[PDB]
């Protein structure tokens, strides 16, 4: 026990996890001695913990240390409101602190209110197939024929485009022929597993 104060060994890693998974922030120090690692949420200033005492009444927040150099903050089953910066703080004089950031992503999930059901329509008609999705980052919707055939996109002026996939929440089919009947798949994806897919049967009589 002599006078030289603790130091941070490395920065707090940014963390990015999906809703419901567990997040851990680690504060790497050296020569901590009798000083205490404090944790708080930077944006709300809410105190989380000091040393081994959890101060927040958030039951999902806990702490641990691997050794005297490695102090962890654990946020269990992360939620959207846990998004933000988490400050590691040492009670030295003057105080020293570091901030790491938590990003809360949400896997895609369909909105049942505006996703198309199976539909039977006369030949030559126009049909809107819709699959609205929610998630963070914002999901992109991709349409495919289940049998691998191409989707037929037409304009009003007499030209058709054959694509194996179409990107967009709304698939607009016009002047449809019997050849276009079949099973259409919309897939909502945003890099956050699992992806979600719905099967829509288009019947043309």
């Amino acid at each position: 026990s002599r006078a030289f104060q603790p130091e941070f060994v490395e920065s707090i890693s940014n963390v990015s996890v999906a809703v419901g998974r567990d997040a851990t922030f680690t504060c790497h120090v050296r020569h901590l001695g009798g000083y205490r690692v404090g944790w708080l949420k930077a944006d709300t200033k809410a105190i989380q913990a000091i040393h081994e005492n959890v101060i927040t009444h958030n039951p999902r927040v806990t702490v641990s240390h691997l050794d005297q150099n490695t102090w962890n903050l654990h946020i269990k089953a992360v939620s959207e409101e846990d998004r933000g910066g988490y400050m590691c703080q040492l009670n030295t004089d003057p105080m020293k602190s570091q901030i790491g950031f938590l990003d809360v992503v949400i896997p895609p999930d369909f909105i049942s209110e505006d996703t198309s059901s199976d539909v039977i329509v006369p030949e030559g008609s126009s049909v809107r197939l819709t699959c609205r999705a929610r998630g963070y980052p914002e999901p992109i919707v991709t349409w495919r024929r289940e049998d691998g055939n191409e989707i037929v996109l037409k304009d009003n002026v007499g030209t058709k485009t054959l694509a194996p996939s179409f990107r967009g929440e709304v698939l607009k089919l016009s002047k449809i022929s019997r050849n276009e009947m079949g099973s259409y798949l919309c897939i909502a994806s945003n890099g956050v597993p699992p992806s979600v897919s719905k099967r829509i049967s288009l019947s043309i009589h």
């Binding site: 200033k45 409101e81 703080q89 004089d93 105080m95």
Partner: protein
């Protein structure tokens, strides 16, 4: 019922340089929550209940049981100490009560 701050708790305090500064914080229905003092300019945790976190020995929090006042004392007040301070209840999410300290010279 959830804890709350006495709204009569002064939001603007003025101390004298070289003397002790006193920031009050009256809390009702504290139950098993804690009352903490935080200094805003560097988000430095000062006290948690009667426990002292800061290594600046000038600081102390006192629980006035008769009035339910968690008072922060700053000895040897300096101009540098002026600014914004937060009294904070450990509910989820936290309750915060902002208090400004001024440090002036008599007359």
């Amino acid at each position: 019922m959830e804890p709350y701050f006495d709204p009569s708790t002064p939001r603007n305090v003025t101390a004298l340089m070289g003397k002790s500064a006193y920031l009050s914080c009256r809390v009702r229905n504290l139950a098993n929550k804690t009352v903490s003092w935080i200094r805003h300019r560097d988000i430095h945790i000062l006290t948690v209940g009667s426990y002292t976190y800061t290594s600046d020995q000038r600081f102390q929090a006192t629980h006035h049981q008769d009035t339910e006042d968690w008072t922060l004392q700053i000895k040897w007040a300096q101009k540098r100490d002026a600014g914004m301070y937060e009294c904070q209840i450990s509910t989820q999410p936290v309750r915060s009560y902002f208090v400004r300290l001024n440090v002036v010279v008599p007359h």
